Design an enzyme around this catalytic site. Structure first.
Site, PDB file in Angstrom:
ATOM      1  N   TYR A  25       0.873  -1.200   0.000  1.00  0.00           N
ATOM      2  CA  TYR A  25       0.000   0.000   0.000  1.00  0.00           C
ATOM      3  C   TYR A  25       0.900   1.237   0.000  1.00  0.00           C
ATOM      4  CZ  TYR A  25      -4.044   2.812   1.833  1.00  0.00           C
ATOM      5  OH  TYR A  25      -5.040   3.725   2.006  1.00  0.00           O
TER       6      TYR A  25
ATOM      7  N   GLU B   2      -6.630   9.987 -25.632  1.00  0.00           N
ATOM      8  CA  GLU B   2      -6.104   8.899 -24.756  1.00  0.00           C
ATOM      9  C   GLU B   2      -7.270   8.223 -24.007  1.00  0.00           C
ATOM     10  OE1 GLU B   2      -4.189   6.018 -22.702  1.00  0.00           O
ATOM     11  OE2 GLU B   2      -3.503   7.136 -24.475  1.00  0.00           O
TER      12      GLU B   2
ATOM     13  N   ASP C 170     -18.369   4.943 -21.844  1.00  0.00           N
ATOM     14  CA  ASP C 170     -18.531   3.677 -22.615  1.00  0.00           C
ATOM     15  C   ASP C 170     -19.555   2.781 -21.929  1.00  0.00           C
ATOM     16  OD1 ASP C 170     -17.299   1.694 -20.875  1.00  0.00           O
ATOM     17  OD2 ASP C 170     -15.354   2.569 -21.451  1.00  0.00           O
TER      18      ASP C 170
ATOM     19  N   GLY D 221      -0.599   3.891 -26.678  1.00  0.00           N
ATOM     20  CA  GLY D 221      -1.362   4.647 -25.662  1.00  0.00           C
ATOM     21  C   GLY D 221      -0.485   5.077 -24.491  1.00  0.00           C
TER      22      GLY D 221
ATOM     23  N   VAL E 291      -4.087   6.330 -19.182  1.00  0.00           N
ATOM     24  CA  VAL E 291      -5.052   7.339 -18.642  1.00  0.00           C
ATOM     25  C   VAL E 291      -4.464   8.060 -17.412  1.00  0.00           C
ATOM     26  CG1 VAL E 291      -6.339   5.770 -17.131  1.00  0.00           C
ATOM     27  CG2 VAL E 291      -7.480   7.726 -18.191  1.00  0.00           C
ATOM     28  N   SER E 292      -3.465   7.497 -16.724  1.00  0.00           N
ATOM     29  CA  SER E 292      -2.794   8.219 -15.605  1.00  0.00           C
ATOM     30  C   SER E 292      -2.180   9.541 -16.078  1.00  0.00           C
ATOM     31  CB  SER E 292      -1.781   7.343 -14.937  1.00  0.00           C
ATOM     32  OG  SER E 292      -0.706   7.075 -15.801  1.00  0.00           O
TER      33      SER E 292
END
Ligand SMILES: Cc1[nH]c(C(=O)Nc2nc3ccc(NC(=O)CCN)cc3s2)c(Cl)c1Cl
Length: 198
Positions: free
Chosen positions: A2, A39, A70, A97, A100-101
């Protein structure tokens, strides 16, 4: 761990914020700004090539944010034991790609809404940093993923407003490249709509 996951994520977000053009493209001529949308859409296209997503809805909001919805499976919501956070948070924050970060890192704010296994899950990010863990907000019979982002106007200069025609050209192209995916474009600023399908 973590803990080690959190440290690695924040170093990644810092890296993208400091060298944004390297990750998203030019931050002044509008290409990086519109790439933020593409993206997110490319991730929905992946979920179409997996055969779950049939329709992608791209909306330009009146506040100059863009949402991509989506009808795929929904980004997984279960706690990923290694990072100890939702698999969604991992996908939204871990640098790959362009991933998405990168969009998240370069967004003042990002709203994530996931429908799956009969529940609605929501999470808010600021500069790629989750405000709170992914949380259930209610029930649903639908599935899919909605990402809405407000691009950082610290990062992006000169071309700061989304251009319908630029989005329309690339979404038309993506529909041609991905036969049988339906890609809708909606402009809440003026009522423009398009429906791309090949
Ligand atoms: C707009 C948008 N959409 C997505 C998006 O749907 N990505 C997704 N990644 C995965 C990865 C794995 C799974 N596996 C399962 O469901 C397993 C069930 N046994 C589902 C999804 S759905 C992303 Cl990422 C973005 Cl951004």
């Amino acid at each position: 761990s973590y803990d080690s996951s959190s440290i690695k994520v924040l170093k990644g977000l810092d890296a993208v914020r400091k060298r944004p053009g390297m990750y998203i493209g030019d931050t002044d001529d509008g290409t990086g700004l519109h790439h933020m949308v593409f993206e997110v859409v490319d991730n929905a296209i992946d979920e179409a090539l997996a055969g779950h997503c049939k329709e992608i809805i791209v909306t330009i909001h009146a506040d100059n944010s863009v949402s991509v919805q989506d009808d795929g499976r929904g980004i997984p919501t279960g706690i990923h034991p290694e990072e100890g956070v939702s698999a969604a948070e991992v996908i939204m924050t871990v640098l790959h790609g362009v991933g998405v970060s990168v969009v998240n890192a370069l967004s003042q704010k990002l709203e994530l809404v996931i429908q799956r296994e009969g529940k609605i899950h929501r999470q808010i990010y600021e500069h790629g940093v989750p405000q709170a863990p992914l949380a259930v907000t209610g029930e649903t019979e639908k599935t899919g993923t909605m990402v809405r982002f407000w691009p950082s106007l610290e990062t992006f200069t000169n071309v700061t407003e989304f251009e319908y025609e630029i989005l329309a050209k690339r979404l038309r192209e993506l529909s041609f490249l991905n036969s049988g995916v339906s890609i809708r474009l909606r402009d809440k600023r003026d009522g423009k709509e398009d429906h791309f399908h090949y």
